[PDB]
Amino acid sequence: SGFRKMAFPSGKVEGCMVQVTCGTTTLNGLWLDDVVYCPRHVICTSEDMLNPNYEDLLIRKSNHNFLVQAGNVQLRVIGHSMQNCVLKLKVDTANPKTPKYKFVRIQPGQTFSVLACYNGSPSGVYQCAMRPNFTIKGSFLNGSCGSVGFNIDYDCVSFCYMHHMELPTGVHAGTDLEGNFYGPFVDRQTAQAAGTDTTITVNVLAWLYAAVINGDRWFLNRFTTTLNDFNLVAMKYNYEPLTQDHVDILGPLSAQTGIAVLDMCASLKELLQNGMNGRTILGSALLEDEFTPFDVVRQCSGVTF
């Protein structure tokens, strides 16, 4: 029993964590086959970051200006290129430990695991989620850029994130592994605006579905509701509008528990209106929306990757 914030096993991605240094700025990289993917603001100086002309700055750099080291071995950088907001550094060697992998642009609301790294050296792992406003609330210090997010399905590591910056709000922003920023964010140390975040409704209902499976059943009520009436309570509380596709995604869970989705929506409706009353569901005095219905089926199924 028990529901905890679980993260995918990090070993496969650890082997690909390298260190890239251009000038004084040193950040992390990801070595898959003969390319080392790193954030492109490695080429900026201390006075370039408010508005860098990344093109001209890179035109001054050559291959030998980039210093890639996969731990203690140094890699001969034989090509350099810029895709969007990342640098793709061809190298003479292919990572012997290159996992079977795929690059993916996850949809807002889907969860992944971060291997927070500093100087190419893995430090630890934790599960973060792409918020509706394309931000992630994680744990990053200066030198964490390049730390990639990822999922693991059976044997494939589907990389989906790379940390780039910390926003004024305290949350963080990154790109996919093609360099396209999640959200409206650009890699320049400017005051950027993270939109009014919302609360992933399909994920709070799935974490409540988990509590029922793990003993916490006090929220379950006699009431019911309509999909539109819970969406009127939702809009008040700045929750994500619920669709029929959410109901169908939460179906497998709704059957293992025998509770209808719209019934669980009444129990949710009534937790928002009357609060928590000092009680705890699955160990939290708040409502948790960082578990997708797959994370709930997975931990309550004993999946192995």
Please say which residue, 2 or 79, places its beta carbon nearer to a second copy.
Answer: 2
Whose Cβ is closer to a second copy: residue 137's or residue 236's? 137
Contact with a second copy (CB under 8 A) among 23, 108, 143, 241: 143
The reply to whether 286 sits near a second copy by the rule CB under 8 A is yes
- Interface with a second copy, residue 124, by CB under 8 A: yes
Q: List the one residue from 25, 26, 111, 144 that touches a second copy (CB under 8 A).
A: 144
Binding site for Cl ion (CB under 5 A): 284-286
Supply the minimum distance, in Å, between the C-beta of residue 138 and a second copy. Answer: 6
Token output for 186: 């650009």
State in angstroms the smallest separation of the CB of 17 from a second copy. Answer: 9
Question: Catalytic residue among 16, 128, 145, 265, which?
Answer: 145
CB-side neighbour CA atoms (13 Å) of 296? 28
Query: What span, in angstroms and rounded, lies between the C-alpha atoms of 1 and 282?
Result: 11
Among all residues, whose Cβ is closest to Cl ion? 284
E strand segments, 33-120: 35-39, 66-70, 73-75, 77-83, 86-91, 101-103, 111-118
The amino acid that residue 271 corresponds to is L
Residue 168's binding partner out of a second copy, Cl ion, none, with CB under 5 to 8 Å set by partner kind: none
Please say if 145 is a catalytic residue. yes
Nearest residue (CB) to Cl ion, 193 versus 285: 285
Applying the rule CB under 8 A, the residues between 180 and 239 that interact with a second copy are: 214-215
C-beta separation of 15 from 97 below 8 A: yes
Residue 241 burial (10 A CB sphere; 0-12, 13-18, 19+): middle
DSSP letter at 215 equals: T
Strands 156-166 and 121-129: unpaired
d(CA 27, CA 147): 9
Cβ neighbours of residue 28 under 8 Å, at least 6 residues apart? Answer: 17, 18, 19, 20, 38, 117, 118, 119, 120, 143, 144, 145, 146, 147
303 binds a second copy (CB under 8 A): yes
Binding mask 147-176 for a second copy (x = CB under 8 A): -------------------x---xxx----
Q: Are 182 and 161 in contact (CB under 8 A)?
A: yes
Query: Quick one: what does residue 117 bind among a second copy, Cl ion, none, with the CB cut-off 5 to 8 Å set by partner type?
Result: a second copy
Q: Which residue has the tokens 């293992």?
A: 256
- In whole angstroms, how close is the CB of 284 to Cl ion at the nearest point? 4
146: three-class secondary structure by DSSP: coil
166 binds, among a second copy, Cl ion, none (CB under 5 to 8 A by kind): a second copy
Catalytic hit among 16, 22, 38, 41? 41
Binding residues (CB under 8 A) for a second copy: these are 1-12, 14-15, 115-119, 121-126, 128, 137-144, 166, 170-172, 214-215, 276, 280, 283-286, 299-300, 302-305
Catalytic residues: 41, 145
